[PDB]
């Protein structure tokens, strides 16, 4: 009967959907750390600087 | 059926969207404190100064 064949494919459908879910989570986690670090590094880059007061010679 | 697979990926889609939301909030909060402090420090920097009145010798 059709009942047996339906159950077999059902298991396969669940496993496939889990794979595509894993890709999206892993990619978002990788891009999270890069975007956070870039923002913090740029903030330090703009604000920091050195200034010359006076120059003397002998 | 397609109904089972749709629900599994749906959960994953919601979790991924939450991650990207967290990045934007955290970055804006970090840049908030830097921009506020820079403005206040510069205002004090320009306004403050010392002046010499008179010099006497013995």
Residue numbers in the entry:
A (entry chain A), B (entry chain D): 25 to 82
From the paper:
Archaeal Type IV pilins and archaellins, which form the subunits of pili and archaella, respectively, are expressed as preproteins with a signal peptide. The pilins/archaellins are then assembled into a filament, wherein the hydrophobic alpha helical N-termini are helically stacked in the core of the filament, and the hydrophilic β-strand-rich heads are oriented towards the filament's periphery. Through single particle cryo-electron microscopy (cryoEM) and helical reconstruction, we solved the structures of these filaments at 2.61 and 2.52 Å resolution for C. divulgatum and O. meridianum, respectively. Atomic model building, bioinformatics analysis, and motility experiments suggest that the C. divulgatum fibre is a nonrotary, likely adhesive T4P, whereas the O. meridianum filament is an archaellum.
